Symmetry: C2
Subunit: 190 residues, 2 copies
């Protein structure tokens, strides 16, 4: 029904507002950020790789947010931004999209992105999903399952861009058995 | 976005209710059915193939509904159910999923489905989408882009189920240039 940031749900006034709204209207589900495009998990993570590079913030208390929503019969979809991650791709530059001039490619906002071809980022993203499911998210929604928008350089292993993203989503499916996953195919078929 | 049936937006009181809701809240979009899983287009269609088999109903006045939503800055996603179509698959049985025993396959509710492998259904669905775009839908959301859940018979041409669906989505992409399309990949990556 509505997309809510981690900051929004981390406000008790705002959390109660969205509970009241769902209780008095047809709304019965929210999308809440797990990891937004800033590259930070929005609650305290216990995942060693996340804690090691500081890729989490106290935007909200995930246990309290999920309990409040569940108590009121509201479905909670966790939004997990994938390759638009300027934290992991800068903390671990081997994982970043490379420039033809060498070094990490930067977009018009001076940000680095993850290279989908580098499968070493995949377990990191999936572990974030797994932890979110353990906390209680009802569904995982993957966003930015794409390359950035002549100066990028890739080692493709002979796979087209749509094929490597499809491989990533198959990996996610295999690693998250029994979990409701969602993602837009027209972020892939372009 | 909240999901609205055709019948719902075809009621003037209900339409106004949902306008009021969007105006007073964070809601800025609705999904409205173009073609639901009953196999009828929810407004009067002028597509010859749709008219020929009676596959439309006056659930709502599409021009009035889109005008009212647009006048209020609400984005309207048109939902287009693809292969769960018991009307086209019964009226044109060559297009139906076949049974191994004989005849058209029927599900647990006694309904026939369209066979994704039969490409002669594809232009019918795309023409519905083209017509909705012409009326003013802002985005097309394809649903039931899947086979039904040992009794179905197919002529696959050597293609797997996920491959023929991707072919269908590629056809939609090519035939609907510049249109915002959406569909859930995990209705295809199983």
């Amino acid at each position: 029904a509505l997309y809510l940031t981690g900051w929004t749900v981390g406000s008790d006034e705002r959390l109660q507002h969205y509970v009241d709204l769902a209780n008095r209207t047809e709304i019965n589900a929210y999308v809440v950020d797990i990891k937004d495009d800033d590259g930070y998990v929005g609650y305290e993570s216990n995942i060693p790789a996340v804690r090691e590079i500081g890729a989490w913030k106290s935007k909200y208390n995930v246990d309290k947010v999920l309990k409040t929503f569940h108590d009121n019969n509201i479905h909670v979809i966790g939004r997990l931004v994938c390759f638009k991650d300027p934290v992991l791709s800068s903390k671990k530059p081997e994982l970043a999209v490379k420039s033809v001039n060498g070094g990490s490619w930067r977009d018009n906002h001076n940000l680095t992105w993850l290279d989908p071809y580098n499968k070493d980022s995949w377990p990191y993203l999936i572990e974030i999903a797994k932890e979110a499911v353990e906390k209680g998210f009802d569904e995982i929604q993957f966003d930015y399952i794409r390359f950035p928008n002549k100066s990028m350089s890739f080692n493709t292993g002979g796979k087209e861009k749509h094929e490597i993203i499809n491989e990533f989503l198959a990996y996610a499916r295999e690693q998250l058995p029994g979990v409701v996953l969602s993602a837009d195919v027209f972020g892939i078929i372009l």
